[PDB]
Amino acid sequence: KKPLTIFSDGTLTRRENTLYFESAKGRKPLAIEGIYDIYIYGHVNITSQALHYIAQKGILIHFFNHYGYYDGTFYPRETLLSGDLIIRQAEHYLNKEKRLFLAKSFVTGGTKNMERNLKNWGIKAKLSDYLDELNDARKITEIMNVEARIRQEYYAKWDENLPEEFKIVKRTRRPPKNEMNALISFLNSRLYATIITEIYNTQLAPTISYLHEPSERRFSLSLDLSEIFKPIIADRVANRLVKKGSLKKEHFREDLNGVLLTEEGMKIVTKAYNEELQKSVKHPKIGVTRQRLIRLEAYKLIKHLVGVEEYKPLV
């Protein structure tokens, strides 16, 4: 079961028990047994029959900007619903100390994975210096504010290892001002959807977060986990793409608003990201897919919420 990604324009339809994508060249069937989540970068129309069909199969649909920024998601009715786990989730938010621990854990994890990135790329960092701020803090806002500076410095330390063309200077998001900002925005937008998909495969309610504020209109928990997995996946993908030379100036375009990837660039980056998502690890002593890790992080969290195993963030 693999992620479906659609750059072309057309219409998703249901011709009975098969799902089709009609374009110029027209009706091509889709094996929906093998489809896990869907990603829409093209201008694509979806019929009610299709959407019903995709919903019936518990498949998520992810929608994106014209320059490939995350737009939104179609979330089908939950299959793995569990009434008690939800209550434990909410109990760890309602209790302030419990919330503080998790909120701190996410930022700790992000900071450590970030400095491991810098350590691996041979940049002297010691972002760890900032952890003292984090762990003695009593309010969530100041915690998040520290995480912001840490991220801000990490980029600026990453720029030392980057050529002027692909240097970050300010993180500029929607919309970018840089080839590198464009790249990172695109990759972060992929990662967000990926984490939402993996959360839908658990009994966790995706709206309840600890670091970020819960909203019934927002998958905030995915934002909580993206703290950890931005460093591990997205940043690495960006770095390898820029440094090995898969992306040149040719794959970027300038308009009045910002800088963006060409369709070619988007496809290159999409494949590299998917290629990292299936790249497997070796814990040098225990002797697993990057995506598996995401779901494992979710399971770690669940074991914490039922008081079984205290939550240590992935490093």
Query: Exposed, middle or buried, 74 (CB in 10 Å: 0-12/13-18/19+)?
Result: middle
Task: Find the binder of its own copies among 188, 209, 239, 291 (CB under 8 A).
Answer: 209
Q: Per the annotation, does 147 bind a ligand?
A: yes
Handedness of CA 292, 39, 154, 168 (dihedral sign): positive
User: According to the binding rule CB under 8 A, does residue 214 interact with its own copies?
Assistant: yes
Q: By CB under 8 A, is residue 65 in contact with its own copies? A: yes
Which tokens belong to 195? Answer: 């984490």
Under rule CB under 5 A, which residues in 135-154 are in contact with Cl ion? 139-140
Could you say whether residue 257 binds its own copies (CB under 8 A)? Answer: no
Consult the annotation and say whether 310 binds a ligand: no
Please indicate if the annotation marks 227 as binding a ligand.
yes
Residue 281 — φ and ψ, nearest 5°?
-105, 160
* 205 lies in the site for its own copies, by CB under 8 A: yes
**Amino acid (one-letter) located at 282:** K
Nearer to its own copies (CB atom), residue 19 or residue 247: 19
Alpha carbon 258 to its chain's center: 22
Strand ranges of the sheet holding 2-6, from the earlier edge strand across to the other edge: 2-6, 35-40, 60-64
Binding residues for its own copies, how many (CB under 8 A)?
56
Which residue has 């990662």 as its token pair? Answer: 191
C-beta of 39 vs 158, nearer to its own copies: 39
From the list its own copies, Cl ion, none, which binds 34 (C-beta under 5 to 8 Å, kind-based)? none
Name which position in 16, 34, 83, 285 contacts its own copies (CB under 8 A): 83
In whole angstroms, give the CA distance from residue 239 to residue 230. Answer: 12
**Residue 91 binds: one of Cl ion, its own copies, none (C-beta under 5 to 8 A by kind):** its own copies
The Cα-based distances of 150 to 73, 144, 268, 272 in angstroms read 29, 10, 29, 27
Pick one of 7, 58, 101, 243: the residue that binds its own copies (CB under 8 A): 58
Cα 215 to chain center, whole Å? 18
Asked if 174 is part of the footprint of Cl ion (rule: CB under 5 A), the reply reads: no
- Count other C-beta atoms under 10 Å from residue 59's C-beta: 20
Report the distance separating Cα 221 and Cα 206, nearest Å. Answer: 5
Q: Compute the least distance from the CB of residue 79 to its own copies, in Å.
A: 5
Binding site residues for Mn(2+), as ranges? 147, 212, 227
Binding site residues, as ranges? 147, 212, 227
* Site residues, its own copies (CB under 8 A): 40, 42-49, 51-52, 55, 58, 60, 63, 65-66, 69-87, 89-91, 93-94, 200, 203, 205-209, 213-220
